[PDB]
Design a protein around this ligand. Structure first.
Ligand SMILES: Cc1cc2c(cc1C)N(C[C@H](O)[C@H](O)[C@H](O)COP(=O)(O)OP(=O)(O)OC[C@H]1O[C@@H](n3cnc4c(N)ncnc43)[C@H](O)[C@@H]1O)c1[nH]c(=O)[nH]c(=O)c1N2
Ligand SMILES: O=C1O[C@H](CO)[C@@H](O)[C@H](O)[C@H]1O
Length: 566
């Protein structure tokens, strides 16, 4: 058989959810196309303490950006999983969600049916939380039962290794003294605070719970669910007509290099990730006709914001050294703008407010005018209001024991304003795309990252944590003296950042009139039966780690797809 009801392109975090849910109807056939293969036995993947091992290996796509001209000019890797399970197989396993009001903004933008209350049941539907044991509670693990699922495919919990220790106790106390409270659960729509966050972990087996272990392997003997692993989707092909486009199927390349077709009777769902789904649309003739014709593609749908509105965060690290060994829980802190900036908040806010229209005008040029000034101003206003009025967190700060006397912190500004893009460089599906996130394009983006770095320096010096810490080692005071200007902080951050690997927005869910690529049922404009369901569709960044929200989005999409089939 090479004809199926649905073809899901990309057996990753989001694609496996859609394939799982659509195959619950035994009369519906579902084909998954995945470029990689199983990592059920890959020790870099299964190890619950293995984050980083897979970097640069054969299961890391290692996509490369262009030289980042606003960030001191180097290329950056954008990592992504090439595996059944996608990027959930190589990620840091943290499970945190979003601010309620920031999901509500999706409807404010024009996406009917996308609010926190609409998404919440789908976060619960995805999740099977293992409650913390008494020793884990003593370590600071907590949850709110009303906002965690107990029955879903994705196991979430805390390491059996979790123990209370000097470092996490001191951090808890130090943040409390700085006015940032310990919160029991960051996944109930209000994320501000200090928390011992849960992970995507099977606590029983002590193994990473990736999307394939959650949504594929326990279901793999469904006779209506088919997998073509080691298989790359090149492009969609269409029914005749030159009318709203009807996808007939997907053109594929097998491991032996042979090009063939598989056919879809109902819909093609594209879940190849934010750095591939827009490329697959372009190769199919759906995108900016000038780019398509330059690259020898016949345009089928004039939708020039395919690949535009790319938004990513950037990550920096700091470190300190204890007088002696440091231990305890890994902690996350989600500070607001006023937590980070204290007395300077009002002037930071006023500078930011004064730059929004300038940011918008600069971003218009990034898409050569396929986003309008007024639309970018409205988008940037919504983001500004979340930061300033709703006080959503502006940073994620991770602290954990780094081994021996080391304390490591990793941090990122959550809501930079820079937008960039991704586009094909050829019609050859193997050619590397031109990927440009435009890191540090706007003043707020580097100024907030510097505020965050300074805040971490201050926390390490604050009581009672300061009684445990002998010195800051990264950057340290030789590199960045106590009185260093913001410019010196920004320069160091630019020299040392990486992508945070949270790209969104390249097939953004917005009304077509304001630049969207998909409607509120994730259907690509100009097509009858093509959807994108993965990070590409998020119209803005979120505060937490992506998988929780991608699973919830894919769960919700699955219900929308089923409703449309009835
Ligand atoms: C290093 C690192 C660390 C983190 C994270 C990312 C990374 C890279 N993230 C982010 C999160 O893991 C990520 O955003 C999602 O897994 C992305 O899910 P998607 O479904 O969008 O794409 P995803 O990349 O999962 O899936 C796309 C699938 O499509 C396949 N594919 C691509 N092109 C194809 C083609 N042409 N044909 C066939 N198949 C194709 C890919 O191989 C892949 O399996 C994270 N999140 C989190 O919640 N907690 C965390 O701690 C972290 N930490
Ligand atoms: O959990 C994590 O996710 C972050 C991205 O979500 C990544 O940058 C950190 O290195 C990692 O610890």
């Amino acid at each position: 058989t090479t004809t199926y009801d649905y073809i899901v392109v990309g057996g990753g975090t989001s694609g496996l959810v859609v394939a799982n849910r659509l195959s619950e109807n035994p009369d519906v056939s579902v084909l998954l196309l995945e470029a990689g293969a199983s990592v059920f036995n890959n020790p870099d993947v299964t190890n619950a303490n293995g984050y980083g091992l897979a970097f640069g290996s054969a299961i890391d796509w290692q996509y490369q950006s262009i030289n980042q001209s606003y960030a001191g000019g180097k290329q950056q890797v954008l990592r992504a999983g090439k595996a059944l399970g996608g990027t959930s197989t190589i990620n840091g396993m943290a499970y945190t969600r979003a601010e309620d009001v920031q999901i509500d903004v999706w409807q404010k933008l024009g996406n009917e049916g996308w609010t926190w209350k609409d998404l919440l049941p789908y976060y619960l539907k995805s999740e099977n939380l293992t409650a913390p044991t008494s020793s884990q509670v003593a370590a600071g693990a907590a949850y709110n039962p009303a906002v965690n699922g107990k029955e879903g495919p994705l196991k979430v919990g805390w390491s059996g290794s979790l123990a209370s220790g000097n470092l996490s106790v001191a951090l808890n106390r130090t943040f409390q003294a700085a006015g940032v409270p310990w919160v029991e659960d960051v996944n109930g729509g209000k994320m501000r605070g200090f928390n011992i966050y849960p992970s995507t972990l099977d606590v029983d087996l002590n193994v990473r719970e990736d999307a394939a272990r959650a949504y594929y392997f326990p279901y793999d003997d469904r006779k209506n669910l088919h997998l073509l692993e080691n298989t790359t989707a090149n492009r969609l092909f269409w029914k005749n007509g030159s009318e709203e486009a009807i996808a007939d199927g997907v053109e594929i390349t097998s491991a032996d290099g042979k090009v063939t077709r598989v056919h879809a009777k109902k819909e093609v769902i594209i879940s190849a990730g934010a750095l591939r789904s827009p490329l697959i649309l372009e190769l199919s003739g759906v995108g900016n006709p000038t780019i398509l014709k330059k690259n020898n593609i016949t345009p089928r749908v004039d939708l020039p914001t395919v690949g535009e509105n790319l938004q990513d965060q950037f990550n920096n690290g700091m470190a300190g050294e204890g007088y002696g060994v440091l231990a305890g829980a890994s902690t996350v802190t989600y500070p607001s703008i006023s937590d980070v900036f204290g007395n300077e908040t009002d002037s930071i806010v006023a500078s930011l407010r004064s730059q929004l229209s300038d940011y918008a005008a600069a971003t218009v040029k990034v898409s050569n005018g396929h986003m309008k000034q007024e639309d970018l101003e409205r988008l940037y206003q919504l983001q500004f209001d979340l930061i300033v009025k709703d006080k959503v967190p502006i940073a994620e700060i991770l602290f954990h024991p780094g081994g021996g006397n080391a304390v490591s912190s990793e941090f990122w500004g959550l809501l930079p304003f820079a937008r960039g893009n991704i586009h094909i460089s050829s019609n050859d599906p193997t050619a590397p795309a031109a990927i440009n996130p435009n890191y540090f394009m706007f003043e707020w983006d580097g100024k907030s990252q510097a505020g965050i770095a300074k805040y971490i320096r201050k926390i390490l010096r604050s009581a009672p944590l300061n009684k445990l810490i002998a010195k800051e080692t990264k950057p340290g005071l030789s590199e960045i003296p106590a009185t260093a200007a913001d410019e010196k902080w920004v320069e160091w951050l630019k020299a040392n950042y990486r992508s945070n690997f949270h790209p969104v927005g390249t097939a953004a869910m917005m009304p077509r009139s304001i630049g969207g690529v998909v409607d509120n049922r994730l259907r690509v404009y100009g097509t009858s039966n093509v959807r994108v369901v993965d990070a590409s569709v998020l119209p803005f960044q979120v505060c937490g780690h992506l998988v929780s929200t991608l699973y919830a989005v894919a769960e919700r999409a699955s219900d929308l797809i089923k409703e449309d089939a009835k």
